[PDB]
C-alpha cells in the first residue's frame, strides 16, 4: 500500500529488487498517528511532518503525510477493500467471545508482539481505542516489550530449555510407525 | 645528447602521477567514509529525538 501511495507524489517503485527499498522507507520513516482526523488536518496545513530519506543512488525524496497514512492501515483496512474491521476492534471481538469470568484480566493483560508492531506510537493509539471499545470502568494495561521483534524466538528458546519438555519432542520411530499424519495427533 | 635531460624528468613524472593519484583516491574515500559515520551519529542522534519526543 506504500508502494501505491507513493506514486501520488511521483515516485514509482515497481519491480521486486524496490520492493525492499519501500520496505526500509516503511520501517525508517513511518509512525502510528495517536488521533487520525486532527493529525491529517494538520499535516495538510503546516510542514513539519514532511521528512527526506536518501535512496541508494542519490536521488532525495521527501514523503509527507505517507509516514502515518500508511500504517493507518492496520487500525481501518477499508484503505485496501478488506471487509475486516481493524487490529483495535479484532482484539476486542476475540475478548468478548471469551467467558464473562476472565475478560477483567485480559483487557489488563494485553501483550504485543512481531516486527510490525514496532513502529513508533502504536501501544498508545491502542490503548486508546480498546478503551474507547472497552468498558470505561475496567483498567486497561497493553504490555509492549522493548524486545518485541525477537519475542517469539526468546519464548522458544526458553521452551526449549525446560525439563518437563523433553518428553514432547516426536521421537522418529514414531513418525516411521505413523508416517508425516503424527504431528496431527496428542503430539503436536 | 639532448634526449636524457627529457627522458629523465618523463620517468620522474610517472611515478609520482601514480602517486599522486593512489593518494588523493585513498583520502577521498577517507572522506567518504567520515561523512557516513558523521550521518550515522546524526541519524542516531534524530532517531533518539523522534522516539521519545515526550512518551
Given at each position: 500500500?506504500?508502494?501505491?501511495?507513493?506514486?501520488?507524489?511521483?515516485?514509482?517503485?515497481?519491480?521486486?529488487?524496490?520492493?525492499?527499498?519501500?520496505?526500509?522507507?516503511?520501517?525508517?520513516?513511518?509512525?502510528?498517528?495517536?488521533?487520525?482526523?486532527?493529525?491529517?488536518?494538520?499535516?495538510?496545513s503546516s510542514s513539519s511532518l514532511e521528512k527526506s530519506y536518501e535512496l541508494p543512488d542519490g536521488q532525495v525524496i521527501t514523503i509527507g503525510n505517507e509516514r502515518?497514512?500508511?500504517?493507518?492501515?492496520?487500525?481501518?483496512?477499508?484503505?485496501?477493500?478488506?471487509?475486516?474491521?481493524?487490529?483495535h476492534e479484532t482484539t476486542y471481538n476475540s475478548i468478548m467471545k471469551c467467558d464473562i469470568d476472565i475478560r477483567k484480566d485480559l483487557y489488563a493483560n494485553n501483550?504485543?508482539?512481531?516486527?510490525?508492531?514496532?513502529?513508533?506510537?502504536?501501544?498508545?493509539?491502542?490503548?486508546?481505542?480498546?478503551?474507547?471499545?472497552?468498558?470505561?470502568?475496567?483498567?486497561?494495561?497493553?504490555?509492549?516489550?522493548?524486545?518485541?521483534?525477537?519475542?517469539?524466538?526468546?519464548?522458544?528458546?526458553?521452551?526449549?530449555?525446560?525439563?518437563?519438555?523433553?518428553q514432547m519432542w516426536i521421537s522418529k520411530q514414531e513418525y516411521d510407525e505413523a508416517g508425516p499424519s503424527i504431528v496431527h495427533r496428542k503430539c503436536f | 645528447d639532448?634526449?636524457?635531460?627529457?627522458?629523465?624528468?618523463?620517468?620522474?613524472?610517472?611515478?609520482?602521477?601514480?602517486?599522486?593519484?593512489?593518494?588523493?583516491?585513498?583520502?577521498?574515500?577517507?572522506?567518504?567514509?567520515?561523512?557516513?559515520?558523521?550521518?550515522?551519529?546524526?541519524?542516531?542522534?534524530?532517531?533518539?529525538?523522534?522516539?521519545?519526543?515526550?512518551?
Amino acid at each position: 500500500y506504500l508502494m501505491k501511495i507513493l506514486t501520488e507524489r511521483g515516485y514509482s517503485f515497481v519491480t521486486t529488487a524496490e520492493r525492499e527499498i519501500v520496505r526500509d522507507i516503511k520501517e525508517k520513516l513511518c509512525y502510528v498517528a495517536l488521533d487520525f482526523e486532527n493529525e491529517m488536518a494538520t499535516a495538510a496545513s503546516s510542514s513539519s511532518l514532511e521528512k527526506s530519506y536518501e535512496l541508494p543512488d542519490g536521488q532525495v525524496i521527501t514523503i509527507g503525510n505517507e509516514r502515518f497514512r500508511c500504517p493507518e492501515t492496520l487500525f481501518q483496512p477499508s484503505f485496501i477493500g478488506m471487509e475486516s474491521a481493524g487490529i483495535h476492534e479484532t482484539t476486542y471481538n476475540s475478548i468478548m467471545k471469551c467467558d464473562i469470568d476472565i475478560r477483567k484480566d485480559l483487557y489488563a493483560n494485553n501483550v504485543l508482539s512481531g516486527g510490525t508492531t514496532m513502529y513508533p506510537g502504536i501501544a498508545d493509539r491502542m490503548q486508546k481505542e480498546i478503551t474507547a471499545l472497552a468498558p470505561s470502568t475496567m483498567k486497561i494495561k497493553i504490555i509492549a516489550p522493548p524486545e518485541r521483534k525477537y519475542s517469539v524466538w526468546i519464548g522458544g528458546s526458553i521452551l526449549a530449555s525446560l525439563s518437563t519438555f523433553q518428553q514432547m519432542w516426536i521421537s522418529k520411530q514414531e513418525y516411521d510407525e505413523a508416517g508425516p499424519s503424527i504431528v496431527h495427533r496428542k503430539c503436536f | 645528447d639532448k634526449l636524457k635531460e627529457a627522458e629523465t624528468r618523463a620517468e620522474f613524472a610517472e611515478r609520482s602521477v601514480t602517486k599522486l593519484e593512489k593518494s588523493i583516491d585513498d583520502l577521498e574515500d577517507e572522506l567518504y567514509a567520515q561523512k557516513l559515520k558523521y550521518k550515522a551519529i546524526s541519524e542516531e542522534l534524530d532517531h533518539a529525538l523522534n522516539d521519545m519526543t515526550s512518551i
